[PDB]
UniProtKB/Swiss-Prot annotation, chain B:
This is Signal transducer and activator of transcription 6. It comes from Homo sapiens (Human). The modification Phosphotyrosine is found at Y474. Tyrosine phosphorylated on Tyr-474 following stimulation by IL4/interleukin-4. Tyrosine phosphorylated following stimulation by IL3/interleukin-3. Dephosphorylation on tyrosine residues by PTPN2 negatively regulates the IL4/interleukin-4 mediated signaling. Belongs to the transcription factor STAT family.
Curated annotation (Swiss-Prot), chain C:
GO terms for molecular function: DNA-binding transcription activator activity, RNA polymerase II-specific; DNA-binding transcription factor activity; DNA-binding transcription factor activity, RNA polymerase II-specific; identical protein binding; protein phosphatase binding; RNA polymerase II cis-regulatory region sequence-specific DNA binding; RNA polymerase II transcription regulatory region sequence-specific DNA binding; transcription coactivator binding. The gene is STAT6. The modification Phosphotyrosine is found at Y479. Changing D257H: In HIES6; likely pathogenic; gain of function in interleukin-4-mediated signaling pathway; increased DNA-binding transcription factor activity; increased protein abundance in patient-derived fibroblasts. Carries out a dual function: signal transduction and activation of transcription. Involved in IL4/interleukin-4- and IL3/interleukin-3-mediated signaling. Tyrosine phosphorylated on Tyr-479 following stimulation by IL4/interleukin-4. Tyrosine phosphorylated following stimulation by IL3/interleukin-3. Dephosphorylation on tyrosine residues by PTPN2 negatively regulates the IL4/interleukin-4 mediated signaling. Mono-ADP-ribosylated by PARP14. Changing D257N: In HIES6; likely pathogenic; increased DNA-binding transcription factor activity; increased STAT6 phosphorylation at baseline and after stimulation with IL4. Keywords: Acetylation, Activator, ADP-ribosylation, Cytoplasm, Disease variant, DNA-binding, Nucleus, Phosphoprotein, SH2 domain, Transcription, Transcription regulation. It is found in: Cytoplasm; Nucleus. GO terms for cellular component: chromatin; cytoplasm; cytosol; nucleoplasm; nucleus; RNA polymerase II transcription regulator complex. This is Signal transducer and activator of transcription 6. Residues 355-470 form the SH2 domain. It is linked to Hyper-IgE syndrome 6, autosomal dominant, with recurrent infections: An immunologic disorder characterized by severe allergic disease with onset in infancy. Common features are treatment-resistant atopic dermatitis, food allergies, asthma, eosinophilic gastrointestinal disease, and severe episodes of anaphylaxis. Half of the patients present with recurrent skin, respiratory, and viral infections. Clinical laboratory testing is notable for eosinophilia and markedly elevated serum IgE levels. Belongs to the transcription factor STAT family.
Amino acid sequence: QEELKFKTGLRRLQHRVGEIHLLREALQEALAMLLQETTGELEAAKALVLKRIQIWKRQQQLAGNGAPFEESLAPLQERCESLVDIYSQLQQEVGAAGGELEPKTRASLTGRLDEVLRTLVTSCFLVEKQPPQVLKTQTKFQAGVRFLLGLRFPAKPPLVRADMVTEKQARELESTGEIINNTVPLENSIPGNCCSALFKNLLLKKIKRCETESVTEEKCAVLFSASFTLGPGKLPIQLQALSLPLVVIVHGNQDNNAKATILWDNAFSEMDRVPFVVAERVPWEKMCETLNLKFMAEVGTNRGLLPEHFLFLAQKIFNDNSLSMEAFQHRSVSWSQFNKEILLGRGFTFWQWFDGVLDLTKRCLRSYWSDRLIIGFISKQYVTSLLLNEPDGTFLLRFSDSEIGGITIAHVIRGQDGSPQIENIQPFSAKDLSIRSLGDRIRDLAQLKNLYPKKPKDEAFRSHYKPEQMGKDGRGYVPATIKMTVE
Amino acid sequence: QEELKFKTGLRRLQHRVGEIHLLREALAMLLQETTGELEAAKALVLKRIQIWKRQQQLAGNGAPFEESLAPLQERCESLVDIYSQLQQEVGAAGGELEPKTRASLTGRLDEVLRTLVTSCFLVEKQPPQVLKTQTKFQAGVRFLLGLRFPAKPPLVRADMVTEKQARELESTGEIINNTVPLENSIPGNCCSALFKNLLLKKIKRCEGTESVTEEKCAVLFSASFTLGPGKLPIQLQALSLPLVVIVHGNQDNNAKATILWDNAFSEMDRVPFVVAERVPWEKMCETLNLKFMAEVGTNRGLLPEHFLFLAQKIFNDNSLSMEAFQHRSVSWSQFNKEILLGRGFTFWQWFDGVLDLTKRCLRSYWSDRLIIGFISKQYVTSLLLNEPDGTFLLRFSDSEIGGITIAHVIRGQDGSPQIENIQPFSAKDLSIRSLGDRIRDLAQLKNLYPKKPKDEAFRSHYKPEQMGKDGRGYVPATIKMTVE
Amino acid sequence: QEELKFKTGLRRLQHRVGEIHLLREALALAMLLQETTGELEAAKALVLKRIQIWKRQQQLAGNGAPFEESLAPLQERCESLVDIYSQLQQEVGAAGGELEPKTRASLTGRLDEVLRTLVTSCFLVEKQPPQVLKTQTKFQAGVRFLLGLRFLPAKPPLVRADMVTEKQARELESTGEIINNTVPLENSIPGNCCSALFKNLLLKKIKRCERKGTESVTEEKCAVLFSASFTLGPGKLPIQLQALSLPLVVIVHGNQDNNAKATILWDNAFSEMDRVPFVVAERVPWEKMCETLNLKFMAEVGTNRGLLPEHFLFLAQKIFNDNSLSMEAFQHRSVSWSQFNKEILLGRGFTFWQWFDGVLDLTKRCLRSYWSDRLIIGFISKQYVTSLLLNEPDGTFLLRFSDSEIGGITIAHVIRGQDGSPQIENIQPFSAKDLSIRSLGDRIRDLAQLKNLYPKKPKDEAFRSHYKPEQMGKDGRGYVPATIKMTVE
Amino acid sequence: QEELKFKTGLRRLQHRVGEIHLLREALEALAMLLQETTGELEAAKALVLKRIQIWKRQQQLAGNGAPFEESLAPLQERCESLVDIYSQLQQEVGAAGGELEPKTRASLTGRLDEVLRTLVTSCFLVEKQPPQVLKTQTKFQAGVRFLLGLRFPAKPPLVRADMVTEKQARELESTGEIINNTVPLENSIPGNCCSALFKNLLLKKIKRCETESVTEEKCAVLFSASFTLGPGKLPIQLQALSLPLVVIVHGNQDNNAKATILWDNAFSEMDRVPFVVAERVPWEKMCETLNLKFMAEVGTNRGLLPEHFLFLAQKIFNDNSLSMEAFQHRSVSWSQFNKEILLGRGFTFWQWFDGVLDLTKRCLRSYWSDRLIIGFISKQYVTSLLLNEPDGTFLLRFSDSEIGGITIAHVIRGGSPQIENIQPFSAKDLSIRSLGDRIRDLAQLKNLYPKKPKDEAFRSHYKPEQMGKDGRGYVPATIKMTVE
DNA sequence: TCTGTCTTCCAGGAAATCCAT
DNA sequence: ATGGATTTCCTGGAAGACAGA
DNA sequence: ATGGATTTCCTGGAAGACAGA
DNA sequence: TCTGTCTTCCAGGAAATCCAT
């Protein structure tokens, strides 16, 4: 760990402040005018903590896209409080003596010190609960900011305002839409041991869009503004904190495309960058990492995609028919390839498809998938090759490549004299499975004997069968049920 | 017709104005005093107006409507014409002895004028009788004498009033876009103001046992002129039919019933908005039959047997003769306020349940008279035990809101013939697979009661099997229905 | 085609008979191949089914629908099959000794069975009698025997015809008897046909089965039965040939014709392939009724273009007493036989069919030309004409069939211009007699007030072709022509 | 008159039979002289027979509409009287005896049974003759009467009816057969008549001998019977022949057939051998018959005039002469009447005449009886008649060029006057729109020749027209007539 | 015991046959 | 070359027979 | 001919606010 | 106190407008 080295380094500063106090006491100057040069060590530690803050912010960006998170944000508050503590004792020691230390340096010392105070508090202003990165108009949402140094400061609490800014407006350094209930006091919770402002009720009334772009790919953020003074008055500092970039939508149907933009950004945003610039193309392998993470995060599964899958995916998106997991790995993929370009005569983009299967699996197949009963991704070619060698009654489940959000059964026919020929059942949508679960639909069909390979259907899907009640309840009404057939 | 009598009497009136005009060649007269008979004609056209309003009220429920409102405007125009000629004839006279008779006459004349104009202000296009908040709707008024009264259009205003506020003679909920000019369309030969865009933002409800959804309101149209000879001021006001305003779809049903009750049984010219608490069950049957045929969209509706079953249900009566119920009365509380024994819903809620089900999914099957629709489990058991194996019928579920169920007969010979009742189908159930198709699926079902063979009956409702292949490269997967 | 499937399979059969003949060079389980060469039975089943199809086509032809008349290739199929049967039987017959005794017998059984069924199915009614048939009036009928050119030479058989009722036809006497009911089944080499034609036939008296439920006499169905026999060596199994006609309804006077027609129409339209004689459904999909009605209209009128969606809507309304206004409401509907011809229209004194056939005869007799010119709306409801014509100018008119009269057509026109409000007037309907006196075109010419045919066609332009020329010349001799024109007051 | 001659002469005979009874009772030459009164009886018999022949002749004349004393009741009475005195007288010879004057007594029985025989054989009459023009495969009737039937009981004798030809009838090869030709001669006491009526007679088919022509072959039905009345037996065979008839196969032969029959009935010689009739006749008698038949078939009380007969003579004789006295002593042949085409026409005189007969009977009886029709004229004489007349004068004449057509001639305009003849109207034309109505339509027709106004003349023949709107919604469409 | 269904009777139009023009 | 003559077939009008209620 | 993109209307599910029994 | 009444909130069909390089 990196964490302990820090406190030892802090121990040094506490010893340092003790020393200077003791000295300014006994005096009452050649050096210790020079001991004040140890506030450089303070400003050093501070910078470190600031970088540390940046690291968390990056971790937050990746939380969207579901990456493990040390979300707590509680100890950083302690680090900062400690720093402002020794700032306090330093400025105070400068306060006395009081003629036992050279006056010209008073300006330099107070200068660096109020400087580090300034920068620290302006950077201790964090968005802790980010607003939804994909955000629908006329729908209520929340966001919450946190001030780490609130617990050390009583003068009237400042009020944080939230305002819609565009990427253009955000670079700098007319409303573009008004936000209701965007006035909240930055309140101080002693039992929560936190200083925070939560906007439990936020609404976006109207929306204004700049002018290929697709609207959806238009990024904005909310600006949290505040100001508060510390007596002696005033030299008031204006606090502002920006959110992660968000896409504003008007209806559910835009959700898919929007998700992609945010996804992309979250993955590939620079740790330090201009709002809101991101790369044009990326390594295909890191894209594989992101796709796996989002898959596992949204489906709600502990185990996700495999190499063969990634291969099939590469094949799909690149239109490359290659067979080696090593050919594609050293390749770049652009955003336009990802979500802007139609693929292979189909009517939809790669992402639109992937998000399709994502929704299908989350909604109806999570159980089956975690049970590793679905191959999920393959070429029709590879099912023909894999299944022709298999006996009559062997089948497998694959995602439909032609329909968005569909899953289809492939099985082997026929036994004995006819040479085996493979059949593909038309895909099931989320609705089709809501009407009758995949497991049960599978149950109806007697003709498939084994799930590829060598696993018999009855053993595999025991847990997914819905029990048929039997009986006449009630009262008088014999249950009517639907089974599924092919011919 | 009474309409024709009107024409006869009016021809008499113009002949009469001819009489007085020629009599003015004096240059005694009780002729204009008996020509005070104009007031009679006025009363008659006013009655006819009352009748048209009643027809529109009954139009609220599905009914025939003579909507035209053109002949009425014509009648009115004719009458204010003879009034005009009358007044002008009275004006130009010596031998107005005594002058007091000039006074009494002028009084009578401008009085009938006033009452005529106050009665010519009609709601031609009524607002929706059950009305949801923050939703756009329309309404339009008509003034029959607008073509005679050029000055600037008045611009009628529409305001939400409550029943309490309506008896009389604030801000209960307000309406945006509630100001429209009363325009005079010469190509239409009509004076009318249509509110093409109206919306109600908020609603505040009067206050104990009765549910909100029976609270009646109306929109009030106000206007004024300010028509020559000046001043001649008279304010026009017209009330709409009573309406019930709702906040969400889930109240719709309960709302409809209130309006229905009101439209069917509102007395002519009642104080707003009184209606009887109980009515003859027969008239209720007429109303129910009408509403059923109207909402389903069918020319053939309920039968004696049906009405009997309904009477048994609503009265909790075990009687078996159709004549027992005929001289019976039925209350509003029975109609929509009393839960049905052992059930979770009121009678209206159930009836409208089947209304919605049939409208949505069964209109065709019903029109083909393949559904009994109404029948008790008992009578089906009795009817079906004597029938052979595989004989079935369709009946509405008594237990579920908006459900239809199959009752069939199976005889094993070894085991005595017994009735089986398939679980009822909801509208969703039928959207997933059609009734015809479902019936096709069940092989055991042989004959629709009585005699009719099932395929012959349901030929027209079977969906064709697509079979074949696609798309592309994909074999169709189909869902069929079974019982075990 | 099915034809190609047949010829390929037949080529296979002849190749197989080649194989078996050659296997006889052994002179085995190769006659187990003989047991699969019993696959001839498949081909038999196929040609029989095709016969069934031809019979069905004839049935629908009787209703004015397209027909493939020929029956020559079918006879060829039959000849081919009895040929391969013949060589097969001769092959089983020859080389008996090696042959297992049970197998030879079982085979012979299977084979002569397929022969028997083939010939019992080769006796067809080729020229049907009239489906609606009047007593003591001459009609004709003709049967054909497809295998007649093979068995004939022996003397030609009698081929007598007898009137049977539906009752008698189910089974499996003398309801009414017929003169000239015996003909020789002659063998015409120039025609390549064995056929027996009844050039002369007359039905003298009809005794009618007993009816209940008000079942009108005119819906009682009967047929004529053709019987014949040989007695053809290879003896000695004389097999009796019988063939039934299409069901027909026999009437006594013209006034029944109309009702008779419907009974036939329904049956022809909807008889379910093979059935016990003579059952047909009581109710059918309204769409199929529309198909049949369209077909019959075009057939009896004699026009290539018939009814439209809007017409069918009007008809659905009429027949169903329904006030619905959407063509989509009626589409998944059923219609019963009682509704079609047994239920009187509530306003009307007549049934739906009677009215419809009324317009059929009217258009046939006087209006085919006008209809083919698409100058007649033909089917409309006065309400819809009022709606359509009120917005139109003075002198705009249309032609619609009368709802109150059987076989009547009426003019609806729009008057009057300017101050008076527009009102629709309906001229009294014209009967066939009325039109014989003076043609529709001429009548329309006479009336000056109607200027435009709906929607915006000028009257003279549209009806130019139907105007009969007036004659300037006076004849004869010395006599000036007297002419009759039409007015309304 | 003759009735008296008979009854007084009969009183003589009865007085004498009383006389013989008294003298034979007084009891040889007496019987010889008293029997010579059977001489006055036999005289009387011949007399009554003549009266019968006269009636038979009148019946022949009954066709062509000549008044008829059809009754045949008094004649029966006369016959009954005669056989009554025959009976008692013959009986007197039998009873008075004892054997007196026997040798001659045999002779007595001879004369007596003779007069009885001739009497009964001549009392066998066809009372209801069959149609003289008779169609094959058609049901017809005929009835015979036996006048002495009430005096003769042994079973009624069979009466049979058979089709005979002229050749066969002379004497003294079925040639067409008759169904239902067997009827019993029944005796009606309440009707006081002995009769046999054949209500259901039909001629199945006919074979005709062979010059010219079809419709000229005359035939008859022969009624045969026998009794076989005591003293036995000397059975006497009764036969009666009908009037001559022409047998036709179709309606279109009717005209020609009629002529033949007409001729015969008019001109059949009394006592003539069947069935000879004259070849030519005086023209005046021909005019008489023509008038009789005209009034008879049209159904009118007043018929043809001198000028008409003149016009007819002119037509048939091809003569252009102008005096009614010229043609009067002329004779006309059968060939001229019906066997000869005239001039430019394709038809005979008779075919034309019966043509106008049918036209008038069918459509003009009313108009003709009202004397609004000239009926017969030449274009020549109408031109002479109308040129001098004012603008608007017209008349009606039968078409000479067409069979069964009537045409309007008028004098317009009216410029020198010039004459027009409208194309003739057939019976069909008049069925489509009545003559009266057609005349109404034409505005130019002002006066019926002469000095009579059209409106006054044809008021009653005008049909009232509505001229109303019904029904329902259907305005009547009417057909009028024009010429240019 | 009338209504309505069913039938038989009968007039006229179209047309086949033969003819002698 | 078509007119006449002589007959049969056959449609629809009209009215008679009859069964069902 | 047209398909896509972008927005609003409105229905019915679900759950939150709430008054009265 | 709490249940059932009443309301607000929000997802997703249709479907209107505009554009379409």
